[PDB]
From a paper:
These enzymes catalyze the reduction of a broad range of unsaturated carbonyl and nitrocompounds, creating stereocenters with high degrees of stereoselectivity. [name]. This enzyme (FOYE), belonging to Class II OYEs, was thoroughly characterized, and despite coming from a mesophilic bacterium, it displayed an unusual thermal stability.
FOYE exhibits a tetrameric quaternary structure in the crystal with four molecules in the asymmetric unit. The electron density for the FMN is clearly visible in all the protomers, indicating good retention of the cofactor throughout the purification process. Using the topological map of Yqjm as a reference, the tetramerization interface arises from the barrel helixes H6 and H7 and part of the loop L6. A small distortion of the helix H7 reduces the distance from the respective counterpart of the other protomer, allowing the formation of a π–π stacking interaction between the histidine residues H304 and a hydrogen bond between S314 and Q316. Moreover, as in the other Class II members, the threonine residue that interacts with the N5 and O4 of the FMN in Class I OYEs is substituted by a cysteine residue (C25 in Figure 4a). Differently from the other tetrameric OYEs, FOYE displays an extended unstructured region in loop L3 (residues 102–149), which is instead found in the other Class II enzymes, although with no homogenous length.
Residue numbers in the entry:
A (entry chain D), B (entry chain C), C (entry chain A), D (entry chain B): -1 to 354
């Protein structure tokens, strides 16, 4: 690349990327017992040949109770690892995208239904399960009060993150994103609205960061040095008394000190009474606040739908990388059109080059 | 549908379609021994969820020597049939498209390379094969002169079409398109530039139509009556002394009498010295000529790239159905954008409805 | 031009046009006593530099009572002629469009309000006037029954058309379009729903065509031979018992025999109880019916909004020229984008070439 | 407006604007003796009905020698004022834009040719004139060395700015933009590359700002209090030893103290050996630097071509208003399309509402 920043090659730690465009993680709710299915090969295989330099696989539960739904991906046994490795192998052969995976634990937001099947969370008798959380504070008022995690629970989930990370590297993923955003377990520890613990893992900012930073360090220590481990954050909670940009800056700096390779900057998701001023680029200001206070790449996301918008965000130095989600659902070849509009050569596998 | 013709439900014989939009067949050159691969599940699965009412699988050889390349799909053994049936099953579960397959024999254009691997056709020592044709007339001057087919050769290929058709119906395909276009075997019989036979299968128009009409009747007789069997034609050869629109009208009328369910109207492909006046809708006039002389649905194709162009073709009654190929490679969700521009509700699988 | 038909130079009679794109006439309702104002210089000057090869000025009344509204253009005195000549001179200096004007008489549809001021027609005491028509049959039930025109009335209006044509030629217009469409005076004579006369100007088709053909012949005879005089028609009435495409074909053939230079093919407008199947290219079929039966250029119009749609209409030979109206109101530089989409050089005046 | 910031009503000093979209000044080189012509009515009248809330008329010379070219607008006599007043009156009748004018003196860049007539500046005997500048330093090496301005020259040109401002207010303009950018006279004083004076108007930053700040204060004092007077700046020179963003921040703050109503942030234009990193939004970072240090509205400009890009600039608080130029030449109804893409009601005069 030469004409635009968006499609110029970029170095993410030890990982050489074809460009600065990222496909954000998007849950598909199409797995069986956490095992990726034909849908994921069709869905992720398309994103891998889209032209983006990095594709982040949807939130993947580190243990059965960490899945958002009974239909989410998991990475806690050999059968799930083999299915994901097959998809990574397809991406290696046909696309120019590096494959990353988002390791997650849904915390108090687990055991829920597909978004297109509205209703209350699955009760244990309906095939659901009781959730875990830093504190016994509910997100869904209609379901069971979450189990407050003991010190041994913290070590169990942390080891599950480590084991899922080791499986991911073995399956061929070149980067890992820890899901500390959108109201799931790590975010639940970070924010005072959900963390009311009275030990050293709740209260002050340093206490609320303590367990998420342990997970990051433990994951980084269990992987080879060339593996990239990043953190997706919710920089603010959009609710009174929640996470502030100053605290998220501090957390992002602490993540960098422990070897995080990038910060993926999102917002919201912690409480139902949030008020989010949704609009084009409504989270770009938060990405710029993070980028100006860390020395690792920052990914912006949120209603980024046009190449000229994406390139301005990079050129004006609001972020280092552009992530898109819904624009890629509408047009999975968004990078093709975007590269042409910016004057760069679009990527296309040989099978598709008669349309180029 | 209610706002446009393009996205109003349509009946193709006994086959109820969600709309009048067709994805034209597009060779992928990604098979192994004729067996569909992961690429085809990714490629065809996406087209099946695109919103189109009908997806026509790429040209599939009825026997090993009928493949265009060593990397084309085949439908002459159980392993190939099972792999295609798996893709059809994916379409039945997630998409609203009916699945069709184009049964083909490449004739004198067989045993060639991938289009992105330029070079001469594969010689027999390179893993290629000598081709079959109605007459010993070469398309590629650098390769072997094709073997002119005897009467028993005609019956062998005809039975191969029948067997592939039976396999296709068993694999779940609801429609079959016989490939009588683009310079392959059936087209080679139809045109005087390639058919110089001295028996009852060459010479007059009725002789040149005789063998293609036999294949159609044999295929239609070997399948259940609710199966749709259509014919893709090259209405003209774009070369002096070749097929004329009057002859293609006659052949299309003869196809209807034999039970053909639709006519898919393309042009060209027979000889290398063709001069094609390519441009937006350059084959639509040929589709209107066929439509005005037959009582079965006519599909138009050829540089149809915009919804307003497609809808005008239907409203002005130049054709009954719209086929797209390259526009679907560039944007596999073309029907999504097209439906919105025409004021109709776009189709999207539930996994993607948060982008709708 | 060389890449598309739409932007290839075209010969309209003795007029050499830059392309085949026409801006259809569009009433602006912004005149004072029929005199063009600053609005018309802003509006028509923009259309003249748009890139279209031909701009047709809105329906211009040949006498005060022939105006649709008190705010319509007129061409029956020196002050109106001078104002229009100033606009034609602006077009000559900056644009590549030839200037045409639509000469009209509203007949029984005259003396009405601006479309954005809904209400009954202006009564004579409100500043309106009683209308003239072939028969005493109302379009608006709330207004005065129109005067049925006597023999001297026919001669008077015909002479008004002649005088306006002479003024138009003197002001610099290179083509004239007679408004025989959309339910106005000439159309009122053509259709049996509005013409119930008992003399030689009503009854048979030959009688209903008689007065419109006299106007055409008289206009053609009064102008220099290189002036182009065309006819805009309503090919059908979209009402039971109205004009048929067969009758409009005959009238269009009679127009050519009198020296008409083109047929502009529209539909509707005669009666309020019409049912029009509106949609993209819904009048293109009617244009093709006329084009196949005359040897003068045919202009298609009606929801033509995209370059690929326009080029398909020309390439498939449904019409000889493409007319647009509402697409040019939405984007007055529609030809700029259209030429780029078709691969041709877009026209731009030197003041705007830093955007090219 | 309510759905987007770009099309929400905005307060610019005492001026109520329909939205936050600005049409940037664009020289047309179509005047005669500084008098606006039919071209300017066509061009500026279209911009006034485009939907933008503010239209800035092209750089207008405060005296004959301050014009960039012999074909630029001037505002130093009654005939020029009356012609501009007739355009403002057209805008007031049909559009929703408030009208502003850019008052300028080209300094050492005066007496040049139309951009589409490349060549050396007009010499005095060819109808050109010798230029004035803070120092006898040439921009064009082929022309006469500019006159270094004496104390009376400063007072004379300052009075010319005052007189033109009074004429502009009398002609109906509601805002004035002083042209302190793009290498013209005021910019020539600000930058050390062009200002080498040894008196109190050169040397230190305080000295280089002294004369531009006098012009602003004198213009502000001669107008009514409700008139808006802004400053267009070149925030950096893109050349070694030129203006820095720190210096432009200081100048912008000094402008605010003396009553400037807004800062319009551009860059470059001072020296020919500049190297500008052109790209989408390449001047937005400079606008944000100004916005973060002043309490008056800041306008961003420079390759802003898409609504999502423009809205992101506002929502992420890089600027308060969006200015477009070349995008408005390509599509003068850019605000119409932009409002629809952002979900707001587009503005259209009643004559055009049948296209909405
Ligand atoms: C269908 C869907 C699934 C998503 N799943 C995830 C997820 O698993 N993990 C995550 O961090 N974000 C998820 N998100 C949020 C996106 O990653 C992204 O942050 C959000 O959609 C805003 O970006 P966009 O406007 O480009 O879509 C999902 C979004 C959608 C629409
Ligand atoms: C990559 C590619 C593969 C194709 N393979 C086939 C094929 O197997 N059988 C066939 O009948 N046409 C084939 N075609 C031709 C298309 O079906 C279609 O008729 C042609 O591309 C014109 O349509 P379009 O302009 O919409 O692309 C292929 C076209 C492309 C671009
Ligand atoms: C505002 C407006 C004014 C029009 N005025 C005229 C007219 O004066 N004479 C005429 O023959 N048609 C007139 N028409 C009809 C158009 O010329 C054209 O035939 C019709 O709008 C369909 O074309 P389109 O879909 O491209 O707009 C007008 C249409 C509009 C929207
Ligand atoms: C034809 C043309 C004329 C221009 N004239 C002026 C001018 O008179 N005064 C000025 O400050 N900028 C002028 N400019 C610069 C623009 O105002 C604007 O700052 C620049 O084009 C970048 O914005 P854009 O990318 O939206 O076009 C002109 C630009 C163009 C293309
Ligand atoms: C036939 C009467 C009339 C024509 O409209 C005479 O010119 C009235 O203006
Ligand atoms: C200083 C002389 C001059 C510069 O503009 C002003 O009078 C000449 O017009
Ligand atoms: Cl293990
Ligand atoms: Cl999520
Ligand atoms: Cl083919
Ligand atoms: Cl009309
Ligand atoms: Cl300038
Ligand atoms: Y323990
Ligand atoms: Y920087
Ligand atoms: Y019909
Ligand atoms: Y009379
Ligand atoms: Y022809
Ligand atoms: Y002096
Ligand atoms: Y703020």
């Amino acid at each position: 690349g030469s004409m635009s920043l968006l499609f110029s090659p970029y170095q993410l730690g030890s990982l050489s990327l074809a460009n600065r465009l990222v496909i954000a993680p998007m849950c598909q709710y199409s797995a069986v017992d956490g095992i990726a299915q034909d849908w994921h090969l069709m869905h992720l295989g398309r994103l891998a040949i889209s032209g983006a330099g990095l594709v982040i696989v949807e939130a993947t539960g580190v243990n059965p109770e960490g899945r958002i739904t009974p239909f989410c991906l998991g990475l806690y046994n050999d059968e799930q690892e083999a299915a994901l490795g097959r998809i990574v192998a397809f991406a290696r052969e046909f696309g120019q995208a590096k494959m990353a995976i988002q390791l997650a634990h849904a915390g108090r937001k687990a055991s829920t239904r597909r978004p297109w099947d509205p209703g209350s969370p699955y009760s244990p008798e309906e095939g659901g399960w009781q959730t875990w959380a830093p504190s016994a504070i509910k997100f869904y008022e209609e379901s069971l009060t979450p189990h407050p995690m003991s010190i041994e629970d913290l070590e169990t989930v942390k080891q599950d993150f480590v084991n899922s990370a080791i499986r991911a590297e073995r399956a061929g993923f070149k980067a890992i994103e820890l899901h500390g955003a959108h109201g799931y377990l790590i975010h639940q520890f970070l924010s005072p609205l959900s963390n009311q613990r009275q030990d050293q893992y709740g209260g002050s900012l340093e206490n609320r960061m303590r367990y998420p930073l342990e997970i990051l360090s433990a994951v980084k220590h269990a992987l080879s040095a060339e593996m990239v481990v990043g953190m997706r954050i919710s920089a603010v909670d959009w609710a009174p008394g929640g996470l502030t940009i100053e605290e998220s800056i501090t957390f992002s700096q602490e993540c960098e000190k422990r070897g995080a390779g990038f910060i993926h900057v999102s917002t919201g998701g912690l409480v139902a009474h949030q008020q989010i001023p949704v609009g084009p680029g409504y989270q770009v200001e938060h990405a710029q606040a993070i980028k100006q206070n860390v020395n690792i790449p920052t990914m912006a996301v949120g209603l980024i739908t046009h190449s000229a918008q994406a390139e301005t965000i990079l050129k004006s130095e609001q972020a280092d990388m552009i992530a898109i989600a819904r624009a890629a659902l509408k047009n999975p070849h968004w990078p093709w059109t975007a590269a042409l509009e910016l004057g760069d050569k679009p990527f296309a596998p040989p099978q598709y080059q008669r349309a180029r």
